[PDB]
Write a protein that binds this ligand. Structure first.
Ligand code: CLA
Ligand code: CLA
Ligand code: CLA
Ligand code: CLA
Ligand code: CLA
Ligand code: CLA
Ligand code: CLA
Ligand code: CLA
Ligand code: CLA
Ligand SMILES: CC(/C=C/C=C(C)/C=C/[C@@]12O[C@]1(C)C[C@@H](O)CC2(C)C)=C\C=C\C=C(C)\C=C\C=C(C)\C=C\[C@@]12O[C@]1(C)C[C@@H](O)CC2(C)C
Ligand code: SF4
Lengths: 74, 219, 203, 42, 742, 48
């Protein structure tokens, strides 16, 4: 009974780490927006162009990882 | 002579058809907007065919009863048209073969005839080309689908003159309409009264006031 | 062009010309629009015709001879149930290998028209056929009735094709009659001929 | 025939045929061998 | 004038258009550049108004789609009848309907799912069905399986006929535009022909077939000894022995002395004691009267002859105090666009479905239907959900029309302009009403909870401390109870047993119907219902009215109907389209319907359903705890959610186990929906970039470059998953409880 | 309803439940026919 729970805990840790690491590494720029560092740490979006860019900042990455942290601790 | 003619009906009914009294309240034969089975020519062709079949049926549904009452046919054979096996719940008779076998044979022969008729209707002269045991010479047709003519269909050579042909066509159309009405009357009388049409006629001639539509429906 | 067709007064399809033997322009579903499909269908039809002719003969001869007192062979439907000198699986395997060799040779002939005309073991023996589906040679045409004028060849091919179609219909009729009624085909024929009216499918 | 064959090669049709065949084979295998938890052939 | 107009072979049937996907739109037909193309190919498939601009092609496509839908429906009906005929225990259930549970599905024996074949009864094992088909078949007079087989064959034939008709009317003879624009003839034929004649024929069937067979069954005769239905038609002696009026024939009908037919055309009302349903004679009488009414009403509009009415003349010649000139150009608007008609019909159908559910639960029309609780619950919930969905769709189509088919130059209407000129007051008043209703309705519950949690049960709004009684509803109930005594002398008893006053009806030891009391809890729940309905109406109306333009965005009509936003400027303009308003109102419709079904289930289990002993006492399923436990949220959570979920979670290892599995699965789906409602596209695109790099390293890069879903697609996926999960959870819980306990 | 059909049902009360049980058993066995042994791979042709 502990095997599956331990693997679920590992899955939660891995997913939260993935979200936070991607948010930290892709902060300065990416292909969708190569000048992300000019706008700042927190900004709403970059408009509907290029197919739509919502939740593009790193503040949104922390925002999304909070839920996974809560679920893992639960 | 116009019967219930309207302004719309008189536009396309030019009188160049047998039995044209200009009666068409619903505009079914209206010239434009034609497709599928609704067309000015197909309706006339179907009317002619239905009239001919109705004449045949009207003669045949009454001949056996007349012969039986006159004593010219065995009694076990003279039956009302609904007791000959057409409606098994109403009655049945024993023939030389099973009823469904008779239906299969009739369907085969009628399909053989009607497919050729339809192929004439589609292609006018195509039915006189392929080998049909030599009978294909006489099935060429005259170009009019409703009146093919030829040795097989007009052996007696009637209607050579155009005026006589028109008179005969008018007579045929009127007789076909009368026979269709008679067949509908046969159906309704058989459904309501429950006895043969000749029996109804004899009962009415016996006492005109005692036997009528009100008698069967009382009041 | 002016040949008789299946439905008089109709227009035969464009991909059916009439050069092929037994051509009547009957293809309402358009199953052979592609030429390769036409070749494959022709080969399949020829093979089916020959196999069904053999099957119809082997079904209807022993039954008729059993109706008379000459033979005592059992019913064709119960032939596989009986016991033989070997298990059915062994006979099936041997037949599978034997027929598979010949079917592989025929497939190689179909794919490439002229690659299997020589005897692999002895190079002296050859097959004289020049048309796909008609192997010819001394093995499959010892009497020499095959090669000849194009008109006679077409007439013979049409005869064979029509006989094969009739045989296919015969075998399927025998199968369905046996499963439905439950008696030999000769018995059904005699019973129907005795009373043509009542003794029919509607019974 | 060419257009029908081209249509039959579209993604959803090929996918449904492949998955139906796979499901049938798996169901038949599980029917012939009812239960299986370890590999016992060795 | 009225005429038949068709075009011959407008299109040619070929498979060349099947090979190339997306032939309807040139942009789609060009080819797939990215994956988004695929997601578009299914989105624009049925948007006929965008493929072209001619009305004729759109009308023809609509006609063909209707024919295909009819064919599919006929196939479904044929399948249901075939399942009833072959794999069912209908013949066993016919003899003992009270002690046997209906079942029409049998599960295979591949994996171990054979535990799903429960002991329904009558020497049969299978899944218990709740469609209510057995009661329909019994009320129709079916007593064998050959008739069901024949019905299935006929359904198959009719489905094939419908498919062929659709093909013929699209590819061989397609009607012209003037054919569809003739609304008077269509209305005449739909009123007199489709409705009146069908109901007349059904009344004739009931008179000739259903009544004698049902009378024989109710007498106690074995189903295998009942004469066949055609024997009643053939043998007049049997009908004379049953109903002597038939001995007189059809003479009374023409004699106008119709009282002689009083034996099988009655006006008693109430429920039948033997079966716990409405009298079949009353049903036949009602069908006959409805047929007469529809046949009379079908000759109102002028078509091809002098007599009749013109719809345009009726609309234009209308004068009133508040209206004025009013309806002048509405005829052209209604006969020009399909979307307005679609919205009107959708709203009417939803309202009719809700009314149908209410009338069906109140007065059971089928024999042995009231005593089968699962069937009643399933029918009520299903019809409520269908009505809610249709009502939601009506507003979306109204917004679509207002966006893309409205021009005030060529086709101008005064009423629409007047409404559009003062939308702010309407929105403000609706907002205030919603706020007030919500505040009062929920504050009552919160006050009750707080007072009960502080040891103050004398300060709550309850039947014992502070009473808020529905006086108007009680007055209406008393009036309805006293109705047949003086106001309706023709009826022997009242229409329904729901009205306070009368007797109790029970069939086979189980309660069928009894009067329903009304108290403070009903008051509170009714006000909650009104609040939810008002909020949904506010959302939909705000979406519809502000579709063309707004104070924030003065040119919203140029962007279209389905656009995500306008930009990050103006402070933020997310979710400004009417599509977003519909997507938001779906949630509130779901909430309202869930609350309604919960209220209905708890009230019916607590105050109506139950069992009766021989002495005469009635024991209800939950023992009447609704009136004291439903006034607080804690009571709703504990006495309904916690108490009634015992059966679903304990169903493992039994024949109901499947339900339990669903009770988990739906939950999962619900949570899944959150992933599509809390996030955005940029994160997923940036992750797919790294995934695509990892693919590129190993030479497995596809030509169709993967792309994250669009914003509208994500919102649609989220709302679809949310609704599906919630509805499946409720379905599993309701079915498990009502099958294990009832 | 004329009490003659009721008397017929009383006289033939037996074997009617037997027919009902046989029909229900056949309806159930329509799914387990292959697992029972009958209607195996042979004779499925135009069968069951
Ligand atoms: C939302 C509705 C709501 C309502 C109506 C009530 C009502 C009530 N509460 Mg509850 N309560 C609520 C929610 C609500 N509560 C909530 C959310 C909480 C927090 C959990 C509480 C917690 C609570 C506590 C702790 C207590 C109460 C108690 C009471 C009573 C005290 C009333 C009072 O003293 O002030 C009324 C004051 C007024 C000034 C009335 C204003 C309204 C007037 C009449 C306006 C009408 C407008 C008019 C039509 C205008 C027309 C103009 C025209 C003439 C031109 C009252 C029955 C008390 C109790 O003991 O009662 C037994 C108590 O101690 N409540
Ligand atoms: C068997 C079917 C039948 C058909 C197809 C026709 C067809 C035709 N009739 Mg004839 N007719 C018939 C029977 C029929 N008739 C009968 C029984 C009578 C009364 C004796 C007439 C008397 C009649 C007159 C007086 C006239 C025609 C004329 C015509 C032509 C125009 C009318 C129209 O197109 O209706 C199309 C009709 C149908 C598609 C069938 C309608 C059947 C309905 C649905 C049933 C109602 C019957 C119900 C049981 C009662 C058309 C060629 C007109 C003409 O110009 O002559 C050439 C004309 O003036 N007809
Ligand atoms: C759902 C409603 C529906 C509607 C509104 C139409 C409408 C139409 N049909 Mg279509 N059709 C339908 C279903 C429908 N069809 C189905 C289910 C089939 C398959 C059988 C067909 C097959 C069909 C054919 C084969 C033809 C049409 C034609 C027509 C047109 C003329 C109809 C006429 O004048 O009646 C005249 C009707 C009668 C005199 C015959 C009634 C007797 C039948 C047997 C009884 C039906 C009664 C029951 C309800 C009209 C556009 C005709 C056409 O193209 O005209 C331009 C035509 O040729 N339809
Ligand atoms: C239109 C087609 C038609 C059709 C289908 C029938 C059909 C039938 N006829 Mg009728 N009949 C017809 C026209 C038709 N008749 C005509 C025009 C006449 C006048 C000569 C008769 C006079 C007639 C007689 C005298 C008899 C029949 C009888 C029969 C039956 C079998 C006869 C047979 O073997 O051939 C069959 C019900 C025979 C019977 O047994 O009827 C009960 C019978 O004896 N028919
Ligand atoms: C087209 C393919 C074809 C196929 C697959 C078969 C298949 C078969 N044939 Mg048929 N047959 C065919 C065409 C075909 N036949 C044709 C064209 C004819 C006309 C000449 C016959 C005439 C025929 C006869 C006369 C007999 C069979 C028999 C057999 C059956 C088993 C024997 C065996 O196959 O050896 C090849 C079979 C033959 C070509 C003839 C030789 C007879 C074999 C060797 C069996 C003799 C065994 C004996 C009768 C059984 C008991 C033995 C005893 C010691 C107790 C088997 C169903 C035999 C049988 O009925 O067994 C059930 C049999 O007696 N067939
Ligand atoms: C409304 C749609 C509908 C639905 C959902 C079902 C559903 C079902 N059918 Mg029914 N059926 C229908 C219409 C429908 N049917 C119609 C119209 C017919 C008449 C042809 C039938 C005749 C029928 C038969 C004869 C059988 C079923 C059976 C089945 C079950 C298994 C199907 C299977 O595994 O196929 C496998 C999938 C493919 C071949 C691909 C399944 C519960 C089977 C059953 O329940 O056996 C226990 C079975 O034997 N059905
Ligand atoms: C009465 C019938 C009806 C009809 C004919 C239409 C017709 C139309 N609608 Mg309307 N609509 C209706 C009712 C109807 N609607 C209702 C009840 C609602 C409320 C939900 C809506 C809400 C609505 C919206 C929000 C939109 C339309 C639009 C459209 C157009 C595009 C259709 C489309 O492309 O879908 C083709 C089909 C699909 C995309 C399939 C989607 C998958 C569905 C959602 C899944 C359901 C799953 C199933 C039930 C659960 C089982 C799961 C299993 C499969 C595993 C079309 C003209 C669209 C438009 O662009 O208009 C201009 C549009 O945006 N409609
Ligand atoms: C359960 C949580 C929840 C709650 C409480 C609300 C609440 C509300 N919604 Mg929201 N909503 C939610 C979830 C929720 N929503 C979700 C999941 C969605 C889907 C996206 C939406 C989408 C949505 C839409 C689309 C709309 C709303 C609207 C509204 C308002 C309706 C008007 C009204 O009833 O106000 C009355 C107040 C209440 C019911 C809230 C509870 C108040 C209680 C009684 C406490 C009061 C106590 C006291 C005053 C507190 C003082 C203590 C302090 C001093 C310490 C209200 C503010 C509608 C709107 O705003 O129009 C008016 C609207 O159009 N909502
Ligand atoms: C206020 C609303 C009201 C309503 C909706 C009804 C409704 C009805 N009345 Mg009642 N009725 C009412 C007030 C009302 N009544 C009053 C005030 C009186 C006293 C004059 C009557 C006296 C009355 C009589 C004398 C009859 C009805 C009948 C009817 C029923 C048939 C209606 C019909 O004639 O068509 C219908 C249930 C008829 C009936 O009961 O037939 C079933 C009938 O004969 N009513
Ligand atoms: C073909 C036919 C009957 C054929 C019967 C046959 C072969 C019977 C054969 C048998 O009996 C035998 C020999 C012997 C028996 O043992 C067996 C049977 C089989 C029983 C009837 C047609 C019968 C046809 C009928 C009655 C048609 C009526 C049409 C009408 C009234 C149309 C009216 C209008 O169309 C107009 C003219 C103009 C429009 O503007 C307005 C409206 C009103 C639409
Ligand atoms: S919908 Fe997305 S892109 Fe548009 S404004 Fe909102 S956050 Fe920005």
């Amino acid at each position: 009974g502990d095997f599956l729970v331990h693997h679920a805990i590992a899955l939660g840790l891995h997913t939260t780490t993935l979200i936070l690491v991607k948010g930290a590494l892709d902060a300065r720029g990416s292909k969708l927006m190569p000048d992300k560092k000019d706008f700042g740490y927190s900004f709403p979006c970059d408009g509907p162009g290029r197919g739509g860019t919502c939740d593009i900042s790193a503040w949104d990455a922390f925002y999304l990882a909070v839920f996974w942290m809560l679920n893992t601790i639960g | 002579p116009l019967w219930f003619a309207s302004s719309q009906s008189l536009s396309y009914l030019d009188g160049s058809l047998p039995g044209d009294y200009g009666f068409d309240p619903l505009g079914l034969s209206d010239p434009e907007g034609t497709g599928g089975f609704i067309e000015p020519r197909w309706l006339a062709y179907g009317e002619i065919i239905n009239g001919r079949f109705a004449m045949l049926g009207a003669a045949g549904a009454i001949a056996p009863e007349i012969l039986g009452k006159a004593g010219l046919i065995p009694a076990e054979t003279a039956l009302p048209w609904f007791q000959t096996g057409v409606i098994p719940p109403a009655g049945t008779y024993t023939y030389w073969a099973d009823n469904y076998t008779l239906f299969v044979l009739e369907m085969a022969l009628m399909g053989f005839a009607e497919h050729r008729r339809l192929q004439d209707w589609y292609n006018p002269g195509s039915m006189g080309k392929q080998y049909f045991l030599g009978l294909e010479k006489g099935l060429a047709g005259s170009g009019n689908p409703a009146y093919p003519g030829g040795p097989f269909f007009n052996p007696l050579g009637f209607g050579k003159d155009e005026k006589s042909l028109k008179e005969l066509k008018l007579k045929e159309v009127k007789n076909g309409r009368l026979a269709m009405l008679a067949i509908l009357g046969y159906f309704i009388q058989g459904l309501v009264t429950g006895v043969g049409p000749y029996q109804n006629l004899l009962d009415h001639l016996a006492d005109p006031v005692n036997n009528n539509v009100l008698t069967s429906l009382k009041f | 062009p002016d040949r008789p067709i299946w439905f008089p007064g109709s227009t035969p399809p464009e991909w059916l010309d009439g050069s092929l033997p037994g051509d009547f322009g009957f293809d309402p579903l358009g199953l052979s629009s592609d030429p390769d499909s036409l070749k494959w269908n022709v080969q399949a039809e020829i093979v089916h015709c020959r196999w069904a002719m053999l099957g119809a003969a082997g079904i209807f001869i022993p039954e008729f001879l059993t109706k008379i007192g000459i033979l005592n062979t059992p019913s064709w439907y119960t032939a596989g149930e009986q016991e033989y000198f070997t298990d059915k699986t062994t006979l099936f395997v041997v037949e599978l290998i034997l027929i598979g060799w010949a079917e592989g040779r025929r497939w190689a002939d179909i794919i490439k028209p002229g690659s299997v005309n020589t005897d692999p073991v002895f190079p002296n023996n050859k097959l004289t056929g020049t048309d796909v589906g008609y192997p010819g040679g001394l093995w499959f045409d010892p009497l020499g009735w095959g090669s000849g004028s194009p008109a006679k060849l077409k007439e013979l091919r049409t005869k064979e094709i029509k006989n094969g179609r009739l045989a296919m219909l015969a075998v399927m009729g025998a199968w369905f009659q046996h499963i439905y009624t439950g008696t030999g085909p000769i018995d059904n024929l005699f019973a129907h001929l005795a009373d043509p009216g009542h003794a029919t499918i509607f019974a | 025939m060419r257009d029908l064959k081209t249509y039959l090669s579209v993604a959803p049709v090929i996918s449904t045929l492949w998955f139906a065949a796979l499901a049938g084979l798996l169901i038949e295998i599980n029917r012939l061998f009812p239960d299986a938890l370890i590999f016992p052939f060795f | 004038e009225v005429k038949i107009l068709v075009d011959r072979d407008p299109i040619k049937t070929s498979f060349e258009e099947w090979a190339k996907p997306g032939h309807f739109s040139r942009t789609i037909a060009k080819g797939p550049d990215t994956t988004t193309w695929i997601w578009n190919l299914h989105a624009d498939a049925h948007d006929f108004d965008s493929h072209t601009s001619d009305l004729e092609e759109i009308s023809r496509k609509v006609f063909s789609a209707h024919f295909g839908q009819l064919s599919i429906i006929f196939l479904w009906l044929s399948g249901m009848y075939f399942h009833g005929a072959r794999f069912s225990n209908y013949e066993a259930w016919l003899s003992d309907p009270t002690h046997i549970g209906p079942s029409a599905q049998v599960v295979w024996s591949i994996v171990g799912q054979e535990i799903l074949n429960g002991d329904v009864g009558g020497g049969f094992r299978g899944i218990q069905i709740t469609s209510g088909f057995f009661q329909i078949w019994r009320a129709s007079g079916i007593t064998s399986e050959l008739q069901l087989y024949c019905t299935a064959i006929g359904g198959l034939v009719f489905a094939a006929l419908m498919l062929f008709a659709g093909w013929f009317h699209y590819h061989k003879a397609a009607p012209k535009l003037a054919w569809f624009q003739d609304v008077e003839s269509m209305l005449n034929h739909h009123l007199a022909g489709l409705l009146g004649l069908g109901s007349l024929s059904w009344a004739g069937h009931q008179v000739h077939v259903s009544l004698p067979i049902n009378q024989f069954l109710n007498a106690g005769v074995d189903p295998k000894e009942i004469p066949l239905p055609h024997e009643f038609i053939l043998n007049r002696d049997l009908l004379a022995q049953l109903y002597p009026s038939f001995a007189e024939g059809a003479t009374p009908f023409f004699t106008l002395n119709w009282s002689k037919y009083a034996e099988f055309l009655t006006f008693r009302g109430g429920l039948d004691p033997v079966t716990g349903g409405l009298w079949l004679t009353d049903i036949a009488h009602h069908h006959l009267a409805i047929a007469i009414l529809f046949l009379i009403a079908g000759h109102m509009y002028r078509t091809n002859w002098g007599i009749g009415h013109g719809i345009k003349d009726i609309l234009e010649a209308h004068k009133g105090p508040f209206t004025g000139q009013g309806h002048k150009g509405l005829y052209e608007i209604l006969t020009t666009s399909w979307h307005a008609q679609l919205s009107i019909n959708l709203a009417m159908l939803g309202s009719l479905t809700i009314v149908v559910a209410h009338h069906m639960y109140s007065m059971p029309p089928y024999p042995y239907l009231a005593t089968d609780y699962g069937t009643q619950l399933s029918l009520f919930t299903h019809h409520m959900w269908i009505g809610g969905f249709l009502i939601v769709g009506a507003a979306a189509h109204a917004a679509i029309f207002m966006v893309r088919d409205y021009d005030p130059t060529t086709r101008y209407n005064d009423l629409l302009d007047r409404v559009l000129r003062h939308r702010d007051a309407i929105i403000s008043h609706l907002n205030w009403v919603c706020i007030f209703l919500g505040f009062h309705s929920f504050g009552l519950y919160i006050h009750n909870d707080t007072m009960s949690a502080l040891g103050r049960p004398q300060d709550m709004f309850s039947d014992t401390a502070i009473q808020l009684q529905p006086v108007f509803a009680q007055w209406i109930q008393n009036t309805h109870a006293l109705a047949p005594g003086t106001t309706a002398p023709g009826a022997t008893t009242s229409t329904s047993l729901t009205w306070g006053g009368g007797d109790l009806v029970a069939v086979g030891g189980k309660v069928a119907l009894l009067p329903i009391p009304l108290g403070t809890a009903d008051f509170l729940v009714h006000h909650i219902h009104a609040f939810t309905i008002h909020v949904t109406v506010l959302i939909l109306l705000k979406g519809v009215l502000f579709a063309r333009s707004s104070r924030l965005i003065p040119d919203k009509a140029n962007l279209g109907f389905r656009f995500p936003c306008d930009g990050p400027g103006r402070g933020g303009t997310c979710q400004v389209s009417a599509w977003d308003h519909v997507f938001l109102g779906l949630f509130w419709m779901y909430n309202a319907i869930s609350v309604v079904i919960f209220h209905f289930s708890w009230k019916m289990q607590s105050d109506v359903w139950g069992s009766i002993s021989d002495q005469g006492v009635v024991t209800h399923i939950t023992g009447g705890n609704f009136a004291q436990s439903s006034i607080t949220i804690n009571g709703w959570l504990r006495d309904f959610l916690w108490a009634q979920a015992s059966q679903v979670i304990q169903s493992y290892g039994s024949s109901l186990s499947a339900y339990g599995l669903f009770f988990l699965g739906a939950h999962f789906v619900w949570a899944f929906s959150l992933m599509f409602l809390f996030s955005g596209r940029g994160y997923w695109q940036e992750l797919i970039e790294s995934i695509v790099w990892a693919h590129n390293k190993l030479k497995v890069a596809p030509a169709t470059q993967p792309r994250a879903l669009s914003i509208v697609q994500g919102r649609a996926v989220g709302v679809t998953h949310y609704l599906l999960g919630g509805i499946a959870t409720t379905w599993a819980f309701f079915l498990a409880r009502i099958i294990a306990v009832g | 309803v004329i009490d003659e059909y009721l008397e017929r049902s009383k006289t033939n009360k037996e074997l009617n439940d037997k027919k009902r049980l046989a029909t229900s058993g056949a309806n159930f066995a329509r799914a387990f026919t292959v697992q029972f042994g009958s209607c195996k791979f042979p004779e499925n042709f135009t069968g069951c």
